[PDB]
Write a protein that binds this ligand. Sequence first.
Ligand SMILES: CCc1cccc(-c2c(F)cccc2[C@](O)(CCCNC(=O)OC)[C@@H]2CCCN(C(=O)CCCNC)C2)c1
Ligand SMILES: CCc1cccc(-c2c(F)cccc2[C@](O)(CCCNC(=O)OC)[C@@H]2CCCN(C(=O)CCCNC)C2)c1
Ligand SMILES: *[C@@H]1O[C@H](CO)[C@@H](O)[C@H](O)[C@H]1NC(C)=O
Length: 337
Amino acid sequence: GNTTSSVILTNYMDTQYYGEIGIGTPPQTFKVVFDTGSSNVWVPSSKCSRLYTACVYHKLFDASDSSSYKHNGTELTLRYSTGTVSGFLSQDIITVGGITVTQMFGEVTEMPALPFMLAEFDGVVGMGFIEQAIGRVTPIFDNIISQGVLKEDVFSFYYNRDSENSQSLGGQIVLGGSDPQHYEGNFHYINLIKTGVWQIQMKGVSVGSSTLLCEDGCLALVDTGASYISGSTSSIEKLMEALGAKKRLFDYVVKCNEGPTLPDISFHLGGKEYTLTSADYVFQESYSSKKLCTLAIHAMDIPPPTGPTWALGATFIRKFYTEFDRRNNRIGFALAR
Ligand SMILES: CCc1cccc(-c2c(F)cccc2[C@](O)(CCCNC(=O)OC)[C@@H]2CCCN(C(=O)CCCNC)C2)c1
Ligand SMILES: CCc1cccc(-c2c(F)cccc2[C@](O)(CCCNC(=O)OC)[C@@H]2CCCN(C(=O)CCCNC)C2)c1
Ligand SMILES: *[C@@H]1O[C@H](CO)[C@@H](O)[C@H](O)[C@H]1NC(C)=O
């Protein structure tokens, strides 16, 4: 084939990037996050009790309104860092961009308020490998590859910086290739450690001059569903001490006036230095010395087998356009524009 279709993404406050998919005949519409760190598709179900307030606030799939719906009913539970959604498997036609596929997805009947009552999106489209798929369900990019329509068996991500009072493009994913209008120069490609997870070798993490962390190598999950960069608690505690940042209940903060003076943070991937300046990783709402500003970095201890591992999320992808290569099992990086 020769198709390279794209999906416009919305940017809610640099922490939630979501686009649209359509499920069923006629299509039912859902805002969903495209997540390279999970491998299942799920949307809230009409059979979800209104006791769950998330199911009152979000859009629900109604199986009985779709002629292309096909019942399965097998129970499904999805484990995340924050917790758990639960429900049953269903099958229907799913449209994403110009591509339509028959997909097995989860109809979710238990959505906890923490965190989904803070989600501007409805569900998740997992972009990982079948090795991580609960129920061993075939992931959606697998079925898309099966259609022989993509120009190349790749997909790529662009996350823009949030613009207030402007209609700037929030984000864009491309199925089948990459958009040169949103990256300059050529891709630098880094092979996966193993098929089954969008994870690469990392050789060091620098706070300015000194290689403070990960000197003998660590892991880096490239996670399009992660809002912040994350590392192990041990690493992040050392990183924040070097930055002079204080911890609150939720976030790591610095005084807003001191933000731009913070040293760069460099991730050593594929023998190249991927640097994020304080202008890249600090939510700079003000410059007042009597106000604290959030860093887009926090600790998340990911358990075996995927972890311990860093997660390069939106904080990282905002600066580096990312191409996920299924055919050659690699990840490409190029400076975002
Ligand atoms: C998208 C999947 C997901 C899972 C769990 C929680 C959330 C979530 C939420 F439900 C409400 C608000 C915020 C969030 C997140 O911040 C992610 C937003 C969507 N992703 C995105 O746009 O990325 C650029 C999560 C809050 C807890 C920590 N976290 C994760 O662990 C992400 C895991 C996804 N990869 C497996 C982010 C999202
Ligand atoms: C804003 C403080 C904070 C710190 C850490 C986590 C969270 C948090 C949460 F506890 C539950 C759900 C969602 C979130 C966040 O989405 C952070 C993303 C999770 N990190 C990640 O990617 O892990 C892998 C926040 C929810 C409120 C808005 N937000 C901000 O960052 C607001 C900062 C702007 N200040 C001006 C995200 C919030
Ligand atoms: C549900 O899926 C499994 C395969 O993953 C299949 O064996 C079973 O028959 C399906 N259920 C229905 C009702 O088709």
